Amino acid sequence: TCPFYKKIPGTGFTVDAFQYGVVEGCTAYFLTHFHSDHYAGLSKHFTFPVYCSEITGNLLKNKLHVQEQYIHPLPLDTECIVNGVKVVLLDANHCPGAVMILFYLPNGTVILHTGDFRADPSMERSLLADQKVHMLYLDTTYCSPEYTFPSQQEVIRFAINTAFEAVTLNPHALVVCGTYSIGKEKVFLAIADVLGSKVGMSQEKYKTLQCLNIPEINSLITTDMCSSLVHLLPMMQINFKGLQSHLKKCGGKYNQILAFRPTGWTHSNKFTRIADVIPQTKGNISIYGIPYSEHSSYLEMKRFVQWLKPQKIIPTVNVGTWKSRSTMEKYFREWKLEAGY
């Protein structure tokens, strides 16, 4: 059964709630982004209206085969009426096509649902500037002060400089990048751009990328592995055994692998600056774990909430334990006492 923090009061609406069968009283299902924990349940057999971004609707039609007649894409930054209720979709700074949803309830209450997001000061100048928000349904993934990580720009600077140095030292090195979902495409696109290569990948991953409206994509990706020196593999294969096996397949073109695992936060973030990051190495294989996050750090989250000044916060992540819930509630009260709302 659908949990309460996926229901929008005063409406017929749910958010990210496709795994519960037919939800009682739901007239429109919203989908914030195409990540499996959120889309779980959708298929060619779904026959209710789904509301989402254009990019999410391209993925629903081509990857999950949802029929066209039930996909309702909305433009961003544009007031739209859905089943008698005004809504707006805003960029969530998460993966491609990911949105936050503003709902203007018939009684005057305004609700913001962040979906999954990486808070940024740019959001302070969106359509959020113009009005009060009563209720915030918040992505609390990293809601504790131990969760620190660098900017995405610093992480990409490290990746590009690391890959360009290695391949200039050894023109017979191959670069490999791990993936298991959409998001984090800048990692492998930026490395291929500095090296003058396309990114090589499976037909299934190429198909997925072609749904994303990324400009000049035909220029940056390929299914011809032999033409590429930056290869994408499943995240599960980014280990010494899986990389050894891959290097065999390349027919003696290469004699070294430099591999990247974009993770979120890891405990090594408590101690190590991005500059000082080192790989794990076995023979001619090196693996770098790089802290490329598509979720808010603690400080980014706190800044956003202290700017928005919501009357009530509903967490949507870390809700299953009492200890997590009590910790989050304590930080929400701190933020409110410090800022004065």
Smaller CB separation from Ni ion, 157 or 186: 186
Q: Which range, of 35-43, 201-209, 234-242, 320-328, touches Ni ion by CB under 5 A? A: 35-43
CB of 34 or CB of 158, closer to Ni ion: 34
Of 17 and 257, the one with the shorter C-beta distance to Ni ion is 17
Q: What's the min distance (Å) between Cβ of 169 and Ni ion?
A: 36
DSSP per-residue letters across 209-269: HHTS--TTGGGTEES-GGG-SEEEEEGGG-SHHHHHHHHHHTTTS-SEEEEEEEES--GGG
Q: Rounded to the nearest 10 degrees, how much is the dihedral formed by the CA atoms of 200, 203, 51, 216?
A: 40
Query: Does residue 113 interact with Ni ion by CB under 5 A?
Result: no
For Ni ion, what does the binding mask look like between residues 306 and 335, x meaning CB under 5 A? ------------------------------
Of the candidate spans 2-10, 115-123, 278-286, 322-330, the one that interacts with Ni ion by CB under 5 A turns out to be 115-123
Q: Which is nearer to Ni ion, 39 or 254 (CB)?
A: 39
Residue 176 β-bridge partners: 231, 259
Nearest-approach distance from CB 282 to Ni ion, in angstroms: 32
Among 17, 99, 101, 116, interactor with Ni ion by CB under 5 A? 116
Comparison of 182 and 195: residue with beta carbon closer to Ni ion: 182
* Residues pairing with 288 in the sheet: 260
Nearer to Ni ion, 35 or 205 (CB): 35
Q: Please, which residues bridge with residue 175 across strands?
A: 230, 258
Phi, psi of 152 (to 5 degrees): -55, -40
- Min dist. Cβ of residue 94 to Ni ion (A): 6
CB of 114 to Ni ion, least distance (A): 11
CB of 183 to Ni ion, least distance (A): 7
* Residue span 118-147 as binding mask against Ni ion, x where in contact by CB under 5 A, dash where not: ------------------------------
Helices (H) and strands (E) in the chain, counts: 8, 18
Q: Which is nearer to Ni ion, 29 or 39 (CB)?
A: 39
Residue 35 in contact with Ni ion, rule: CB under 5 A: yes
Cα 179 to chain centroid, rounded: 12
Contact 97, 54 (CB under 8 A): yes
Burial of 295 (0-12, 13-18, 19+ CB in 10 A): buried
- In contact, 194 and 159? CB cutoff 8 Å: no
Question: Rule CB under 5 A: is residue 16 a binding residue for Ni ion?
Answer: no
Residue 338: HSE in the Cβ half-sphere, 13 Å Cα cutoff: 11
Residues at the site binding Ni ion, with contacts judged by CB under 5 A: 35, 116
